[PDB]
Amino acid sequence: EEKILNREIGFAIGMPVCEFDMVKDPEVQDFRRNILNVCKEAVDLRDLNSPHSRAMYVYPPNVESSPELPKHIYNKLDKGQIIVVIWVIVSPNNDKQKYTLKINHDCVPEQVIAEAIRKKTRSQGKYILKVCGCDEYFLEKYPLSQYKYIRSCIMLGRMPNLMLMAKESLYSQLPMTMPSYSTKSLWVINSALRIKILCATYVNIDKIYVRTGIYHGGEPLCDNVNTQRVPCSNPRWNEWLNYDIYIPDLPRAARLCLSICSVKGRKEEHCPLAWGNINLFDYTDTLVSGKMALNLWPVPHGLEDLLNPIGVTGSNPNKETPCLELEFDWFSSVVKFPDMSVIEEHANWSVRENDKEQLKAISTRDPLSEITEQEKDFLWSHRHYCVTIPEILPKLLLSVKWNSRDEVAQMYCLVKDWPPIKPEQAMELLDCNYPDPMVRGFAVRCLEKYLTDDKLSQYLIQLVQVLKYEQYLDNLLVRFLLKKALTNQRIGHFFFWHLKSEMHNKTVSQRFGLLLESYCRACGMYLKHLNRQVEAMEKLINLTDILKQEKKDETQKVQMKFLVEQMRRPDFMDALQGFLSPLNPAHQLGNLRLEECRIMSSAKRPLWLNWENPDIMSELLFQNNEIIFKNGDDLRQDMLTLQIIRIMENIWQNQGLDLRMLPYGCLSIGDCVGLIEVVRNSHTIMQIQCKGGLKGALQFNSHTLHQWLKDKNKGEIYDAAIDLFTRSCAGYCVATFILGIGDRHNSNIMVKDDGQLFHIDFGHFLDFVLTQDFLIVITKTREFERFQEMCYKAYLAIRQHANLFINLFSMMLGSGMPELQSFDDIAYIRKTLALDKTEQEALEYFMKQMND
Numbered sequence: 110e111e112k113i114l115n116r117e118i119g120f121a122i123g124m125p126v127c128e129f130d131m132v133k134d135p136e137v138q139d140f141r142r143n144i145l146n147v148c149k150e151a152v153d154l155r156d157l158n159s160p161h162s163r164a165m166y167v168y169p170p171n172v173e174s175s176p177e178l179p180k181h182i183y184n185k186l187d188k189g190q191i192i193v194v195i196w197v198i199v200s201p202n203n204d205k206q207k208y209t210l211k212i213n214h215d216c217v218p219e220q221v222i223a224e225a226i227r228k229k230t231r232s233q234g235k236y237i238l239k240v241c242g243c244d245e246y247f248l249e250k251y252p253l254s255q256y257k258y259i260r261s262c263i264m265l266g267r268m269p270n271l272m273l274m275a276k277e278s279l280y281s282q283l284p285m286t287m288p289s290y291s292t293k294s295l296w297v298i299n300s301a302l303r304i305k306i307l308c309a310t311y312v313n314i315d316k317i318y319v320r321t322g323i324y325h326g327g328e329p330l331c332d333n334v335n336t337q338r339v340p341c342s343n344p345r346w347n348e349w350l351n352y353d354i355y356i357p358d359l360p361r362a363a364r365l366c367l368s369i370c371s372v373k374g375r376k377e378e379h380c381p382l383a384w385g386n387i388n389l390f391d392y393t394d395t396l397v398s399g400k401m402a403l404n405l406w407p408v409p410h411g412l413e414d415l416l417n418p419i420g421v422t423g424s425n426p427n428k429e430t431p432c433l434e435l436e437f438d439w440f441s442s443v444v445k446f447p448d449m450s451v452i453e454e455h456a457n458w459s460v461r462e463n464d465k466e467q468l469k470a471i472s473t474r475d476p477l478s479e480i481t482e483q484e485k486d487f488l489w490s491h492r493h494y495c496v497t498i499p500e501i502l503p504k505l506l507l508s509v510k511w512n513s514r515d516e517v518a519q520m521y522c523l524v525k526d527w528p529p530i531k532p533e534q535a536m537e538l539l540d541c542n543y544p545d546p547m548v549r550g551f552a553v554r555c556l557e558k559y560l561t562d563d564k565l566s567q568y569l570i571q572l573v574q575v576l577k578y579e580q581y582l583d584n585l586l587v588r589f590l591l592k593k594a595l596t597n598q599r600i601g602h603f604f605f606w607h608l609k610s611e612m613h614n615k616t617v618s619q620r621f622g623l624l625l626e627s628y629c630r631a632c633g634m635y636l637k638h639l640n641r642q643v644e645a646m647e648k649l650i651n652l653t654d655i656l657k658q659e660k661k662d663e664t665q666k667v668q669m670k671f672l673v674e675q676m677r678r679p680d681f682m683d684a685l686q687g688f689l690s691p692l693n694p695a696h697q698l699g700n701l702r703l704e705e706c707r708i709m710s711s712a713k714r715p716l717w718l719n720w721e722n723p724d725i726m727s728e729l730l731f732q733n734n735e736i737i738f739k740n741g742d743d744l745r746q747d748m749l750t751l752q753i754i755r756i757m758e759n760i761w762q763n764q765g766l767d768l769r770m771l772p773y774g775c776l777s778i779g780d781c782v783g784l785i786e787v788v789r790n791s792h793t794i795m796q797i798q799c800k801g802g803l804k805g806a807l808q809f810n811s812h813t814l815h816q817w818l819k820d821k822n823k824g825e826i827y828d829a830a831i832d833l834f835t836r837s838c839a840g841y842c843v844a845t846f847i848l849g850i851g852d853r854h855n856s857n858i859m860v861k862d863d864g865q866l867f868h869i870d871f872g873h874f875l876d877f878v879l880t881q882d883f884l885i886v887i888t889k890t891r892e893f894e895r896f897q898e899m900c901y902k903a904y905l906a907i908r909q910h911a912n913l914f915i916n917l918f919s920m921m922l923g924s925g926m927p928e929l930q931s932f933d934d935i936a937y938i939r940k941t942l943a944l945d946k947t948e949q950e951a952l953e954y955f956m957k958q959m960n961d
């Protein structure tokens with residue numbers, strides 16, 4: 110009954126649901142019950158126009174955010190019309206009958222269906238269109254060219270192949286539950302803040318001390334205060350630390366950031382041994398008081414500082430770790446943060462053309478540009494004129510003295526009536542610099558208003574990451590993402606996998622596990638599919654573990670014999686066949702084609718897997734799905750680079766710059782485990798050179814690449830391939846340069862039969878690469894001038910969207926990626942984009958880099 114659902118949820122998360130029942134934290138239990146409101150609202154939205162609304166939940170339209178086709182895409186059409194092939198399965202014999210149409214690019218799915226009925230009768234609105242080869246439907250009245258598949262066909266030159274299907278055939282397959290577990294004002298406390306550091310347990314160099322601070326985000330609200338140094342032992346300090354801040358001046362998001370530091374005498378070497386952060390107010394707005402024990406966390410690699418203020422808040426669940434005992438003051442009553450009306454009353458009681466141009470210039474600086482003390486005072490004094498340049502809100506929020514309740518009360522009034530800003534600008538307000546709940550609430554409301562499901566999917570990795578910067582389990586951001594996940598199954602699929610992949614990380618495991626329980630409880634029959642995906646991934650992790658540890662250096666043929674022997678076991682055959690691809694849940698993975706699978710020779714010995722596509726029309730898309738499974742590489746850097754490449758391509762496409770990129774799929778499934786989408790018909794430059802080269806001859810020649818392209822494209826198709834190569838080469842030259850991608854050797858650069866060039870392996874970023882061989886394919890015979898112009902325009906287009914790229918990296922700051930540990934790492938993009946120069950000065954910098 111409910112025990113069956115809880116067992117399936119437990120297998121999906123990787124931890125039993127009864128472990129959440131054991132958690133005594135009132136915040137945990139209140140989250141579990143209060144989040145059910147979002148579950149019910151999503152379930153009600155699915156039954157609104159049932160069964161059509163339920164079908165659009167399971168099969169949402171995969172569309173672009175704009176119907177307007179850029180001038181260069183419209184030119185690929187035949188007088189604004191497209192040729193589509195509509196297929197029908199006739200039964201008996203399941204014969205595939207096609208009907209070819211020439212219709213307006215903006216025809217809605219029902220108009221396409223009506224035109225197919227006309228063509229079929231040359232030898233009624235109860236039909237739907239499906240993409241041939243995959244479980245993707247056109248269930249919504251969008252213009253046909255707005256669907257990503259159709260838009261992608263126009264660009265790739267391919268002909269769209271759709272399948273006409275009875276509406277009742279699909280609706281019949283759509284499957285048809287609340288769980289059992291369902292004062293003084295802060296401003297009247299006249300005293301200053303003091304916190305007692307009692308003692309530490311589970312700390313066995315010369316002397317030890319506790320480093321403390323009051324922080325709002327990563328900014329200290331007063332000076333940091335340390336306890337006395339004590340000789341190691343299990344130190345007792347019994348010392349009240351006094352902060353230069355009065356209790357009423359404490360902002361709502363104020364935190365205590367602790368560290369147990371060691372001192373080693375030589376000048377003195379100070380090292381943090383463990384760290385922990387505490388919210389000074391709990392989720393119910395109560396200022397903390399009384400005794401409290403905090404279990405600390407291990408210091409993350411590359412900290413450098415003594416405190417970790419960006420780090421997660423709360424006690425380490427492993428209670429066998431350094432444990433610090435603290436005491437807060439009790440003011441003879443439960444103290445609460447004042448209501449918005451009370452703050453409003455205090456904000457009221459708290460009271461040129463050269464200025465307008467200076468405010469406009471400050472507003473246009475990137476998120477990492479430094480804002481001086483004079484500028485902060487200038488912005489705050491003109492705070493009322495600022496509501497007329499809404500894009501200045503991030504700069505104005507950093508000008509506020511958060512340790513002054515008079516300025517904060519006035520900022521709350523400005524935030525309450527601030528005009529909405531674009532989602533790419535509102536995402537800046539969700540990073541670690543903006544912990545204030547009013548600032549975060551405004552940013553979330555801008556996302557609910559202006560974020561399409563396409564853009565939400567595009568930015569999902571950052572939105573799941575910024576959940577770690579939230580003070581509490583229950584917040585506006587989590588409610589927004591969970592609702593969107595429970596009303597769009599494509600969002601829910603990746604939402605589940607982004608959370609599940611981080612369950613090994615104990616700093617987030619409880620937050621993400623509780624969030625996963627509410628998702629699994631309301632996602633419906635998709636939980637059964639997710640369980641099959643989980644089981645296939647576990648079986649592949651076990652298989653690659655044995656391969657890398659036991660048969661580490663065995664031959665490929667002896668490795669395959671173990672693979673085939675393990676795929677003789679019933680549990681393995683069941684687990685690795687008949688499940689949806691986590692890279693794209695529209696792709697069903699049928700039977701494993703072991704004869705096409707292999708253990709790759711590459712580092713960590715990845716698995717190259719091949720499955721039959723069991724779609725009735727598989728031949729019209731791809732008969733087999735190939736996926737690389739890797740155990741050992743942190744695929745998070747690759748995921749982020751692949752997302753950035755996708756965004757850069759959209760920037761270029763919308764500006765009339767057809768620079769074709771290949772952001773293939775990559776998904777992190779857990780700790781250094783994951784999947785990589787195989788681009789079919791592709792080869793590395795090293796493989797192209799070791800094809801033109803013979804047995805014993807040099808595997809090194811700069812004229813081989815252009816020769817292999819000519820053999821693959823003879824005739825009229827040669828001109829198209831050279832143009833595609835030039836455009837894609839231009840895009841990747843600009844991209845790898847701006848992002849500072851390393852290891853750009855001929856085994857990490859690939860080419861497709863059609864001329865399309867792309868890069869792979871992004872283990873290095875944020876710290877130019879071209880060969881003579883590529884120049885031969887593209888020295889300056891008019892083709893180099895056209896290629897140069899492409900690079901210049903591509904470089905400037907990315908420079909105009911620099912704030913978005915800086916923000917996407919800034920939101921990932923708390924992931925733990927070795928190449929992205931502070932805002933100084935992101936400053937590498939400010940240098941390549943030359944944001945400290947003018948538009949013409951940045952182009953000359955880029956031209957000097959290209960000529961070098």
Ligand SMILES: CNS(=O)(=O)N1CC[C@H](N2CCc3c(-c4cnc(N)nc4)nc(N4CCOCC4)nc32)C1
Nearest residue numbers: 711742747773785786787788791792793869870871
């Ligand atoms: C075609 N040559 S090959 O002989 O099959 N083979 C020879 C070696 C080469 N390997 C080596 C590593 C590798 C990766 C890869 C692995 N780890 C990360 N982190 N990032 C990318 N990705 C692809 N690709 C295939 C094309 O589509 C995109 C994915 N291939 C790869 C394939």
